[PDB]
């Protein structure tokens, strides 16, 4: 089954995925020159104060915190959005090394990991409905760059040794993500895909422009997971990114200039 190895790694999806080579396959590259300021964006509308989470599971290709979506408690709107999306999880995309492990990239620069924050629009009442309509989820994607810790980040790392392996889960209650935001909500946006099969094009990307920092030893911790189950030869968690794909007939937009 598909993963991030020699294997069945990214270059292989596509012969389970055959969307994987469709037209508006994410992540791509952010040229930040090409993308087109457009003052016509609202400011985009965070509202988690009312987040409820519930529990982090180690799913064999990341890690899920998942929220109580049964009700508009943590919602994104405006930006380019219509109409209201539901927090459902977060996770996170991480490398070997500091200097890969996001998928989007920012004039070809890469990040040590990439947030995302995943919802589905209200109007389609469930997330398995969401993701089969062209506008059915929007991801804020928010980068990690290794520098200062970030504490809002401290809790879910201390719970990582309790889900090492694939299906491992944990409760995960009170968390605030909140405190995963950096302080500026510029953003670019587009249209395009889930990063992991079955890269449903169902995604209204918006990525943020300022990273978040986190530190190196908080990022060690990222990597300590495992892809296998326990009881299985321990692989490493790590790189599980996919990387750039073409932006065919796309414009990223810029909230700001
Ligand atoms: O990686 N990923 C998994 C699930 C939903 C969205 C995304 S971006
Ligand atoms: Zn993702």
Redesign the pocket.
Same mark, same amino acid.
């Given at each position: 089954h598909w993963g991030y190895g020699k294997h069945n790694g990214p270059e292989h999806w596509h012969k389970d995925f055959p969307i994987a080579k469709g037209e508006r396959q994410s992540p791509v590259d952010i040229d930040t020159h090409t993308a087109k300021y457009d003052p016509s964006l609202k400011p985009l509308s965070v509202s988690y104060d009312q987040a409820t989470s519930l529990r982090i599971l180690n799913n064999g290709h990341?890690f899920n915190v998942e929220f109580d979506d049964s009700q508009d408690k943590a919602v994104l709107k405006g930006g380019p959005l219509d109409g209201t999306y539901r927090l459902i999880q977060f !996770?996170? !995309?991480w490398g070997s090394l500091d200097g890969q492990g996001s *998928?989007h990239t920012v004039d070809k620069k890469k990040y040590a990991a *990439?947030l !995302?924050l @995943?919802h589905w629009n209200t109007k389609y009442g469930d997330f398995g409905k969401a993701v089969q309509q062209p506008d059915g989820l929007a @991801?804020l994607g928010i980068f990690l760059k290794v520098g200062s810790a970030k504490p809002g980040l401290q809790k879910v790392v201390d719970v990582l040794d309790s889900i090492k392996t694939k299906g491992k889960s944990a409760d995960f209650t009170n968390f605030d993500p909140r405190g995963l935001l950096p302080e500026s909500l510029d953003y670019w946006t587009y249209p395009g895909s889930? %990063? %992991?099969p079955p890269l449903l094009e169902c995604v209204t990307w918006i990525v943020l422009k300022e990273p978040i920092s986190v530190s190196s030893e908080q990022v060690l911790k990222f990597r300590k997971l495992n892809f296998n189950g326990e009881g299985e030869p321990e692989e490493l968690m790590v790189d599980n990114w996919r990387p750039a794909q073409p932006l065919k007939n796309r414009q990223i937009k810029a909230s700001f200039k």
């Open positions: 990341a !996770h996170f !995309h *998928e *990439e !995302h @995943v @991801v889930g %990063t %992991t």
